[PDB]
Write a protein that binds this ligand. Sequence first.
Ligand SMILES: NC(=[NH2+])c1ccc2nc(C(O)(O)c3nc4ccc(C(N)=[NH2+])cc4[nH]3)[nH]c2c1
Ligand SMILES: [Ca+2]
Ligand SMILES: [Mg+2]
Ligand SMILES: [Zn+2]
Ligand SMILES: [Zn+2]
Ligand SMILES: [Zn+2]
Length: 223
Amino acid sequence: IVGGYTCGANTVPYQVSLNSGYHFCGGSLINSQWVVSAAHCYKSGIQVRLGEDNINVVEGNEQFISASKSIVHPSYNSNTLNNDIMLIKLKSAASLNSRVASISLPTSCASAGTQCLISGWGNTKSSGTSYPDVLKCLKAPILSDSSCKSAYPGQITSNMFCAGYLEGGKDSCQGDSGGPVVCSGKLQGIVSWGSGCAQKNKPGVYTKVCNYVSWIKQTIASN
Ligand SMILES: NC(=[NH2+])c1ccc2nc(C(O)(O)c3nc4ccc(C(N)=[NH2+])cc4[nH]3)[nH]c2c1
Ligand SMILES: [Ca+2]
Ligand SMILES: [Mg+2]
Ligand SMILES: [Zn+2]
Ligand SMILES: [Zn+2]
Ligand SMILES: [Zn+2]
């Protein structure tokens, strides 16, 4: 997250860190047994870590659980990143508490203008590499589809939305990938892609979760 702030330990209790020997992507807990992340974060051998704040120190509120299965969206296109969402089932159900909680899926989509909270342990430098150990947060509004499409002509589909600042300076970045974009209490987006990070007129692009609620509900009930 570039231009964000330190969230504070466990202030984003539905945030997960996907680890395959090191943190490589974020995710969101939707119920005690399932996590939603991005399909471009797909790997074999994933351990999900809940209750994290400093991912390099065992501070006492973590739960490390292995995934039993991953389901990448059936229509995910790795070239365009369209339908960039994946579901991960945990081997054991997580114990939910104040520090580990699930986020709700949306009943409708959110309007341009709505402020959201984006978080993750991704890169914090636009030009450079600096990876934080504690969770970083960023509040950004959803941008109109028109400014999103002008920034990325022919690359935006109806399953994506941009959020951010056109002036640059604040954005999610690699490492934040798969993470949550929560607006008004609902998980509205998944950190998906962008052109570098925090560049002027290059906002972040997020998977539009409201278009996948029936697929998610059906998939988890049948697995
Ligand atoms: N080595 C790894 N463990 C790793 C993990 C995730 C990655 N994801 C990318 C990316 O290159 O695919 C990537 N994910 C992005 C998310 C947001 C923005 C943005 N808002 N500017 C840009 C991004 N670039 N490379 C990655 C490398
Ligand atoms: Ca920790
Ligand atoms: Mg994240
Ligand atoms: Zn990138
Ligand atoms: Zn990359
Ligand atoms: Zn990524």
